[PDB]
Design a protein around this ligand. Structure first.
Ligand SMILES: Nc1ncnc2c1ncn2[C@@H]1O[C@H](COP(=O)(O)OP(=O)(O)OP(=O)(O)O)[C@@H](O)[C@H]1O
Lengths: 302, 95
């Protein structure tokens, strides 16, 4: 996996070629001083937001970028899903009002982005897992605003493509059982296969890639995003070894359970990390607080 | 106590001298947002008043909890959430 493949998955690199099959989005290049604020290595202050008698912190203010972002939000209907070149702040859901990535103002976006480690990684480590000797390319960072959608749970799937062949489809929320997926498993696989043939295959910038889809309440397949074909992308119900190793992912099934040999492997969840999102880098809270009391006593001594 | 949904907490707080693992822990400043772990929930807390042992935080996301529950406190340090201390709820504004 080269640095060039990570470059091709930036929103702005691919969005112009797939507008008609994905969610309407607006892309804003990041001003230099907005990027410096998001890179701030100190404590989080949000830009744009008993007798009690201490520093009062303020964030920097970006009046003209705020109005340019507000206009872009209103052009999308007033509600947007934000992301950077690659990543959305999905790991900071717990800090937002209603635990929701839905944003109506720039300061909503700021609170999520500055709390998100996925966003931190876009800035600081975009080309990790890259097996490339070349120097790192310089990135032009961008704010991606997508029209907000109320997505039905359990309708997102991840699709792995290898040398222009769809070799696997994994349910995206693979740690959660949905009854209606196995009931519609044939209808889902065929809708994804037709979508891939008409609107995806031979059209992305690489032969090997991952793409995410949403199938709406009417069965229509929508493209969500492209991700690199490599360890940086969560393999979900697959391993990268079997996806890379030219094996047969479909498994061991008889002519009764069998579908067409060309069909990709469809893995969904049967009858049955995400929690470290809302936990710190150190990580019941009973034993944790007992531990901080101990550590506090030990630091005072030495 | 009675479990209620709080939008603001008055707390006793206690900070470490140094981060775990070493950089010294800054005192609480108003308008900084801390990560608050309360049981199996996390939320944000904007510092809105400070005394030596007592603080107030306005929550970014309301949380169901109760007076006397203990909380863990984390600060953004070099773009990572880092534990700085813990606290305990004395009082709160509820909706
Ligand atoms: N327009 C939208 N409105 C609402 N929710 C959305 C929208 N687009 C995406 N989502 C939700 O956000 C999730 C992340 O979407 P996306 O694939 O764009 O993010 P990502 O950070 O690039 O992905 P990943 O971390 O899985 O590689 C989706 O699985 C879906 O639940």
């Amino acid at each position: 996996m080269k640095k060039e493949h990570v470059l091709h998955c930036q929103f702005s690199a691919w969005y112009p070629f797939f507008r008609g099959v994905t969610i309407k989005s607006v892309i804003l290049p990041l001003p230099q001083n907005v990027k410096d604020y998001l890179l701030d290595d100190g404590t989080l202050v949000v830009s744009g937001r008993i007798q009690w008698s201490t520093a009062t912190l303020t964030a920097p203010e970006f009046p003209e970028f705020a109005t340019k972002v507000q206009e872009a939000i209103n052009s999308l209907g007033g509600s947007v899903f934000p992301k950077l070149n690659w990543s959305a702040p999905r790991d900071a859901y717990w800090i937002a009002m209603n635990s929701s990535l839905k944003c109506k103002t720039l300061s909503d976006i700021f609170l999520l982005f500055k709390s998100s480690d996925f966003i931190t990684r876009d800035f600081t480590q975009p080309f990790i897992h890259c097996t490339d000797d070349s120097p790192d390319p310089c990135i032009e960072y961008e704010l991606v605003l997508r029209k907000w959608c109320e997505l039905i749970p359990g309708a997102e799937f991840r699709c792995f493509v290898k040398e222009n062949k769809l070799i696997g489809i994994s349910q995206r929320d693979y740690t959660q059982y949905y009854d209606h997926i196995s009931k519609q498993k044939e209808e889902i696989r065929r809708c994804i296969q037709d979508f891939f043939k008409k609107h995806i295959q031979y059209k992305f910038l690489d032969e090997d890639f991952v793409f995410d889809i949403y199938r709406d309440s009417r069965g229509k397949v929508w493209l969500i995003d492209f991700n690199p074909f490599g360890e940086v992308t969560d393999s979900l119900l697959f391993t990268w070894e079997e996806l890379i190793s030219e094996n047969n992912l479909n498994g061991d099934f008889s002519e009764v359970d069998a579908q067409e040999q060309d069909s990709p492997a469809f893995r969904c969840t049967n009858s049955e990390p995400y929690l470290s999102y809302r936990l710190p880098k150190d990580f019941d809270a009973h034993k944790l607080i007992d531990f901080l009391k101990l550590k506090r006593n030990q630091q005072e001594d030495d | 106590a009675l479990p209620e949904i709080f939008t603001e907490l008055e707390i006793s707080y206690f900070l470490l001298r140094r981060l775990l693992g070493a950089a010294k822990v800054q005192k609480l400043s108003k308008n900084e947002v801390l990560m608050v772990n309360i049981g199996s929930l996390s939320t944000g807390g904007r510092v809105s008043a400070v005394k030596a042992d007592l603080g107030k935080i306005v929550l970014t996301n309301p949380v169901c909890t109760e007076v006397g529950e203990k909380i863990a406190l984390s600060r953004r340090v070099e773009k990572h959430w880092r534990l700085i201390g813990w606290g305990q709820i004395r009082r709160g504004v509820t909706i």
